[PDB]
Amino acid sequence: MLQPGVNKFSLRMFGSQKAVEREQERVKIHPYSDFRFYWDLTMLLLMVGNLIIIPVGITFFKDENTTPWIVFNVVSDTFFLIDLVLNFRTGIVVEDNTDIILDPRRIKMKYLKSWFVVDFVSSIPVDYIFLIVETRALRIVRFTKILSLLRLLRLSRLIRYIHQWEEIFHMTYDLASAVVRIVNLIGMMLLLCHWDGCLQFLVPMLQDFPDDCWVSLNNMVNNSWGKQYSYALFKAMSHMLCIGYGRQAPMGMSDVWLTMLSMIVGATCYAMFIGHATALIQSLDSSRRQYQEKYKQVEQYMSFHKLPPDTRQRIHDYYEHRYQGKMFDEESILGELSEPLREEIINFNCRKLVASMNFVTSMLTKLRFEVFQPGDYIIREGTIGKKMYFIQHGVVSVLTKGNKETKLADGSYFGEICLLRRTASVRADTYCRLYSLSVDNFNEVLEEYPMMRRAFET
Template sequence: MNRSLLTGPNNETMTRGWRSLFLPRVTKQSLHVYGSEAAVQKECDRQRETSSWVIHPFSAIRNYYILLMLVLTFLNLLAIPIGIAFLDSEHHFRAWEIFNLFSDTVFVLDILVNFRMGVITDQKVILQPKEIRHHYLKSWFALDLISAFPLDYIILIAKSFEEHSDTSSFSASKLVRVIMFARIFSLARLLRVSKLWRFFTEWEQVSNANMEAVRLILRIMGLFLMILLLCHWNGCIQFLVPVLQEFPEHSWVVRENLTNATLGEQYSVAVFRALSHMIGISYGSAEPPSDETELWIVMTSMVSGALMYTMMVASIAAMMTNGDAPAKAFRSKMSQLEDYMTYRKLPRELRTRICNYFQARHQGKWFDEEDIFKLVSRPLREEILNVRCANVLNSVPMFRNRDANFSNAVLLKLRREVFQEGDLITHPNAPGDRMFFVERGRVLVTTATVQAELCDGDCFGELCLLNKGHCTAMVQATSLVRLYSLSAGSFEEVLQGFPEIREELYQTAHERLRV
């Protein structure tokens, strides 16, 4: 055993002061990545040593910040088309202008914040500012820069210049129209919707839940929201064209007596008209389009309606046929397991424990790892196992700094095991035929003289591995724990090819027994 009794994280230290908002919290996601509360506390210590001004991906302040950005992005999604098409009065325009200036400011600041925001990559957290900067510049920086272009500040400066200059009324009117048309380019801010995908991807990386149901719900909600937004934007464009033409007498706005109507009435009729075009009920009014411009707007609405139908059919077909294959296989195995438990009339509590174990072991995905390993060469298998569990092996003194061929041979013999909270892993006087490496979780080791808690990176049973004796300690899982086991028989097979290491290890074991 590597370590004596470990104490849990000092909650008072983690929550003391505003700086604790930058540190990771103990949540389901952080426990899945780090394995235990003690490991989360170590991550807090690592961040304090790295930089106190880096926002950790599992910190409280990042959750608040993400919520702010998502709400602001959604408001932009709704407000920008309405502001461009409908808000022509000075009171409404100023409110919309203030909102846009605030959004531009927040999005520009967001770029700066991202240079100090920790990054999750392959269940690893990057906290070094230089690495964060390099990762951000290579990934999302260009898209964020385009979407955060401060167009409204430029419009404000242009308007201020126009108000203080001695331009003719024609030039002033032309400038106002150009400014109004330029506001359309503020739709580039809607590129910030990509943040929603980024956050969902990160959540999926660190979550051990079955994501298929959540993904399906999000797809349905996304499809429904996209249809609503398509109708919303289409209605705003329907009204924007007559606004740019200064409401000609033959326009549909004048025919419907909406020139001086309220904002709510104008918007409702415009969306109804757009929806009528999209679903092919009518032109949206009693008369057909009155001029060429209105005709093209109607045809565009009809085409967008056809696109909406195509998108609905394609999305539904994709949901039905292009599901997650490993998740489907997992559900099939889960259904088979439930049928078996029902057929054998197993008690309800036992059924629950079996289902929880199956979920924890496979995490919502079914892969036949042995079959996958048969598909690749031995060097590739060794590389895969080095990525997965080399750190676990190197944390044990008897395997540390060994020949790479010996380490790879041992890695090929490791077997992954999962124990639930309360499970007995070993008990006194039981045959000791294997050694265990703790990947994630906590176990309690109890002997006649000592009691110790082990967690990520620890091991136990190394003497039994060499001497094939009986266990002298009771080891019980105190949380969901993922282990790698190495049987004595498999280890003996490895040692046959490395006689020098075999002699050294057995000599060390005999010396420890004499002590």
């Protein structure tokens, strides 16, 4: 299973099949192996369970040496040693370059600059081994508890595993991905609040019961772990939201300093999260802002030249019925694409129109999109012929004595004459989305294409 390649992500990370096979011959543990996926899924599950339950067990409750908590801790930590020794035989992507690092020497030397020390200190049963090497009892309990808090260093594993797997899975960068990111931020913040509540319940217990503690004043001595956890989370979330100090203001120096640090970090983190979410939602609403800026610049330009209200209203109508209220660019998007994709776009969008009438593939590279408005002349009499048109969605009425009122439907074509002084003229009935072809473009595309131009001229 160490050989990578799964249609869920490998076929998207590597569009062609062969590249995926190339990954396989790279082996001839891999980052993209399915066994790695299963291992990291089980990891995330069990280790998030640890990050949630360990602060509850070690801060609240008594008689920690009971069988269920002990066996849970030892099995989790043994899995942690397993993945720790696995980290000495693995591979990661470096600076986005796909490097297998199947050599243990490399995955040791270059890993000797990572956070390996954090994983070392976290993934060893410090509480048990420190108790054994020592073997004042309350003081030893204090050390073993405060070092048991070091099991929460698995947040580093969580964040690194998320970072290596944030880019693997995507569906659509719309509200679906944005809500995923904001939900991840909210989950991290509630994890922080849970940790802070457990800390504010444990620091009194670590000192043993004070008389100047929030626990004594609130009489939360021997009621329940559920209510105590609920009220500690209450204090932590009130601190970050800046509601207050719960029921009573701090009374003891220990709790004064504790609430000071808790509320400073909570307020700072809440402000950071709120600003990040606001920036994310503005990025979601980015498409409207560009159009708003362009329209405000247009309005200021019209005011700078003192245009009459009729022209201003016509300009407003043209802008609202050209860009449809949110902005895009023809030139840049058609210039930042490879040849096959550009020809695919110009074929699908603009081939049915020409098919209603390799020269064509070279003529299609000169069709300029163009939108007019009702009542506006397209071609005017007395104007030298310089352009034709290819209706994509519009109805143009020819102005002629014979052609009193016509409605040219989709896929029509006019102005072709004088290509090879307009005889007539046409208006716009509805919102017509024309195309265009300058006579110079036709002359060029023809003169680099002579081997059929010798019959085109006829």
